[PDB]
Amino acid sequence: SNAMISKLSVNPTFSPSYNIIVDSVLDFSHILEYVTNKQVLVVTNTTVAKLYLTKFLAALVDDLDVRTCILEDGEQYKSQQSLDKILSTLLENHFTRNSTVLVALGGGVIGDITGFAAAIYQRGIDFIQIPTTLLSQVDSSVGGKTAINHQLGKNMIGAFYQPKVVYTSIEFYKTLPQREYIAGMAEVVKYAFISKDFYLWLDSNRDKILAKDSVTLIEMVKRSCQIKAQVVAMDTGARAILNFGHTFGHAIEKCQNYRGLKHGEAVGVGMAQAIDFSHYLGLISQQQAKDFNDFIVSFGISIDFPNDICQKEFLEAMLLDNKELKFILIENIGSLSLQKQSKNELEQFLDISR
Amino acid sequence: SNAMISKLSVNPTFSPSYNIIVDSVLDFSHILEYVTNKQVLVVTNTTVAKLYLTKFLAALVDDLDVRTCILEDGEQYKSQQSLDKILSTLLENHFTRNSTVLVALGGGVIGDITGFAAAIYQRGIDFIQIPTTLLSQVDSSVGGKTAINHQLGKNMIGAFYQPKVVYTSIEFYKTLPQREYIAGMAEVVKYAFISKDFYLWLDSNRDKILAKDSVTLIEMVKRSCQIKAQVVAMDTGARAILNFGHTFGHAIEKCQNYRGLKHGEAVGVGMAQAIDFSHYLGLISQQQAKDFNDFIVSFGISIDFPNDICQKEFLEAMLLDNKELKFILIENIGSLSLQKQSKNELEQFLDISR
Numbered sequence: 001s002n003a004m005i006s007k008l009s010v011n012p013t014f015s016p017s018y019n020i021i022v023d024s025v026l027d028f029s030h031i032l033e034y035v036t037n038k039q040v041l042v043v044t045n046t047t048v049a050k051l052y053l054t055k056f057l058a059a060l061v062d063d064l065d066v067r068t069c070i071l072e073d074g075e076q077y078k079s080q081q082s083l084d085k086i087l088s089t090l091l092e093n094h095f096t097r098n099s100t101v102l103v104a105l106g107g108g109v110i111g112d113i114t115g116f117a118a119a120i121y122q123r124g125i126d127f128i129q130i131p132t133t134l135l136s137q138v139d140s141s142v143g144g145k146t147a148i149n150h151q152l153g154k155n156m157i158g159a160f161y162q163p164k165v166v167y168t169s170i171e172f173y174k175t176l177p178q179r180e181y182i183a184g185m186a187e188v189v190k191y192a193f194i195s196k197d198f199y200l201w202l203d204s205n206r207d208k209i210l211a212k213d214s215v216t217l218i219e220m221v222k223r224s225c226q227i228k229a230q231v232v233a234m235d236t237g238a239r240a241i242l243n244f245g246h247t248f249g250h251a252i253e254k255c256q257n258y259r260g261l262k263h264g265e266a267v268g269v270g271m272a273q274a275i276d277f278s279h280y281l282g283l284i285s286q287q288q289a290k291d292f293n294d295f296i297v298s299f300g301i302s303i304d305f306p307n308d309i310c311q312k313e314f315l316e317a318m319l320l321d322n323k324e325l326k327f328i329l330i331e332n333i334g335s336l337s338l339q340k341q342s343k344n345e346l347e348q349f350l351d352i353s354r
Numbered sequence: 355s356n357a358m359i360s361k362l363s364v365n366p367t368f369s370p371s372y373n374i375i376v377d378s379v380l381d382f383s384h385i386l387e388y389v390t391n392k393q394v395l396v397v398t399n400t401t402v403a404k405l406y407l408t409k410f411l412a413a414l415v416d417d418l419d420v421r422t423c424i425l426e427d428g429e430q431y432k433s434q435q436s437l438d439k440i441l442s443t444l445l446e447n448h449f450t451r452n453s454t455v456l457v458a459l460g461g462g463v464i465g466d467i468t469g470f471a472a473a474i475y476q477r478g479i480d481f482i483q484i485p486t487t488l489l490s491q492v493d494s495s496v497g498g499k500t501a502i503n504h505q506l507g508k509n510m511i512g513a514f515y516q517p518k519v520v521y522t523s524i525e526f527y528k529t530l531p532q533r534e535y536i537a538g539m540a541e542v543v544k545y546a547f548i549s550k551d552f553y554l555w556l557d558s559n560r561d562k563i564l565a566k567d568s569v570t571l572i573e574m575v576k577r578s579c580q581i582k583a584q585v586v587a588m589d590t591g592a593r594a595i596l597n598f599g600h601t602f603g604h605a606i607e608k609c610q611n612y613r614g615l616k617h618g619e620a621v622g623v624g625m626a627q628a629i630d631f632s633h634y635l636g637l638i639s640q641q642q643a644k645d646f647n648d649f650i651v652s653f654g655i656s657i658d659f660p661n662d663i664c665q666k667e668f669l670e671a672m673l674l675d676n677k678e679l680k681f682i683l684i685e686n687i688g689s690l691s692l693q694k695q696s697k698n699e700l701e702q703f704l705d706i707s708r
């Protein structure tokens with residue numbers, strides 16, 4: 001009835017609009033409009049299932065044809081093998097193209113695979129997202145990227161597929177581990193470097209954000225989503241800025257074998273590097289770099305570069321992406337650029353690092 | 355230089371236009387414009403490879419980064435297993451999202467899997483079709499359907515993906531088995547039931563078509579493609595008519611385990627059934643039905659219903675598609691309709707059949 005909620009209309013230029021709902025309580029009924037008289041398959045992992053599945057099923061339980069596919073927890077399971085489980089469940093239970101809906105209940109991993117499945121099953125069926133991690137709330141909810149991993153590369157197979165609705169709740173943070181939360185906070189901070197307005201907003205509401213004030217967190221999520229929506233709306237060209245800090249981030253994950261820092265933790269460290277590298281190239285002053293890194297730390301995000309990564313391998317990891325060597329660099333808050341830079345510059349910059 | 359060719363612009367409403375090139379000679383250079391300075395992977399099966407691969411590679415051979423993936427011949431190989439071979443080849447050889455092109459050199463099976471691979475590899479890369487069968491020339495070249503089979507269902511996983519160009523040659527018929535050719539001719543005839551103009555054209559050029567006059571065959575292919583292009587342009591709603599005779603067709607294939615009649619042969623028999631069923635329902639007169647079936651036979655297509663299919667299983671095969679029981683029925687040449695019909699009607703109609 002009278003519970004703080006927030007809706008944000010996202011309107012893809014090549015698809016019908018949908019809205020991202022962010023609420024203070026956990027009330028899965030906000031999605032019944034897209035689940036009625038439909039064959040529903042919920043995809044989750046063991047953990048999210050343990051915590052939310054029986055509550056979710058209970059929020060429907062209206063004699064509706066509902067099935068579940070519980071994948072294993074982990075990035076390794078965003079695989080073809082898991083995709084086949086989702087696809088067999090759909091085929092074994094004769095889920096038609098017309099009244100089928102996949103519901104992705106979980107974090108980014110579940111969101112990617114479920115979205116991809118929905119994109120290919122009979123060349124596309126309704127897809128509903130329920131991001132249960134901060135990172136997936138502010139990053140998966142907009143853009144339409146869906147994908148799965150291959151032994152030879154992560155996120156190499158996928159599709160652009162929009163959801164019918166995105167329902168999420170700040171209540172999910174009550175069960176989300178501190179590291180996972182902070183990892184997602186790195187994505188939020190990224191939007192602050194993209195948008196000067198957001199930067200000022202976060203800087204003013206830090207106290208409430210850290211104290212987890214419901215009204216504030218809801219708006220924080222909403223504004224992050226608006227920024228990504230506005231960036232993709234520019235079409236994919238100047239959209240590259242969303243990769244601020246990912247070049248260094250992806251390389252950290254590759255060097256640790258994706259068993260060190262979480263994805264979001266790597267982005268945090270990566271942004272700190274893009275900043276320092278931006279200064280090295282003379283794009284920002286030392287003061288600006290100190291201020292920017294301070295800001296990341298300001299929100300509990302760690303910017304320390306992992307001790308177990310060698311310079312040799314780290315440099316090699318960044319060159320694999322002959323082609324040209326492009327980075328997302330900062331010139332000012334709200335001013336990021338896709339910038340081509342030599343291997344020498346990169347190598348010389350990493351010497352200060354060791 | 356001076357060789358009869360035919361281009362037909364197809365303009366998908368949700369994608370850039372492309373054109374279907376149909377020529378009298380085999381000259382693969384008509385595609386160099388979409389292969390220059392690109393990493394090229396050619397997908398084919400053992401047979402098409404045997405006959406055309408070394409000619410194809412020789413038509414490029416300009417120090418270009420070209421690779422091949424030779425799948426096994428057969429519908430059974432339009433599988434995830436084959437899709438993985440195409441995907442590993444792309445990843446092992448570091449084919450980027452930006453200068454990659456998949457070339458589907460073969461018939462419909464190769465066209466579907468290659469198109470699907472191109473649709474998902476890094477969420478979409480350039481796709482080029484070289485249909486080597488009559489059926490794939492007039493059916494795969496328009497519409498954008500790509501798919502792969504699953505043990506639990508044929509063409510259940512796929513994507514809508516348009517090509518950059520479609521190059522084909524009537525020269526391919528010189529190596530194409532009579533049955534395969536005739537099977538493709540069933541698809542051409544289908545367009546005659548869809549379009550009264552085409553019907554009249556085929557009826558006038560039968561002699562030349564059967565005698566394989568180059569100028570005539572080229573136009574036949576061109577006009578078939580125009581019809582499908584015009585049908586999909588109506589958007590997917592009234593587009594169902596393209597399934598004229600497929601309801602019965604798919605059922606024949608299911609009963610024979612896809613080891614009896616070829617796909618196109620089944621469509622031929624299927625159309626003959628849709629016609630007889632249309633008469634049974636009182637939509638067309640007996641004379642019309644006799645005329646329509648005569649016309650199919652007119653082009654060397656067989657309309658005999660397979661002797662090895664039991665009524666029991668055949669009826670069961672058609673009900674699997676509770677939902678409603680819809681057929682594409684004829685009311686006149688150029689007048690097909692998606693028509694809902696009872697199980698009783700269907701069963702009663704099949705009694706005349708045995």
Ligand SMILES: NC(=O)c1ccc[n+]([C@@H]2O[C@H](COP(=O)([O-])OP(=O)(O)OC[C@H]3O[C@@H](n4cnc5c(N)ncnc54)[C@H](O)[C@@H]3O)[C@@H](O)[C@H]2O)c1
Pocket residue numbers: 045047048051073074075078106107108109110112132133135136139140141142143144145146147155172173175176177180183263264
């Ligand atoms: N396609 C996109 O737009 C996009 C954008 C960003 C990230 N991603 C993808 O997202 C993935 C990582 O995202 P992520 O940070 O959600 O990681 P994740 O999906 O692996 O989730 C991390 C962990 O948190 C658990 N978890 C999730 N929600 C929880 C909750 N409410 N309470 C307790 N535990 C919970 C999961 O079981 C898992 O162990 C990456 O694979 C990345 O490729 C996709």
Ligand SMILES: NC(=O)c1ccc[n+]([C@@H]2O[C@H](COP(=O)([O-])OP(=O)(O)OC[C@H]3O[C@@H](n4cnc5c(N)ncnc54)[C@H](O)[C@@H]3O)[C@@H](O)[C@H]2O)c1
Pocket residue numbers: 399401402405427428429432460461462463464466486487489490493494495496497498499500501509526527529530531534537617618
């Ligand atoms: N997506 C679409 O728009 C669409 C439309 C119609 C059919 N299809 C698909 O196409 C498939 C069947 O099409 P098809 O009739 O091309 O069958 P096919 O692709 O299996 O080819 C039939 C046989 O002909 C051989 N062959 C092909 N070209 C040849 C040539 N020039 N000379 C000698 N041999 C040759 C092949 O090796 C194969 O044995 C079905 O799986 C169907 O799903 C797709």
Ligand SMILES: [Cl-]
Pocket residue numbers: 243244245246247248274327328329
């Ligand atoms: Cl970067």
Ligand SMILES: [Cl-]
Pocket residue numbers: 597598599600601602628681682683
């Ligand atoms: Cl039919």
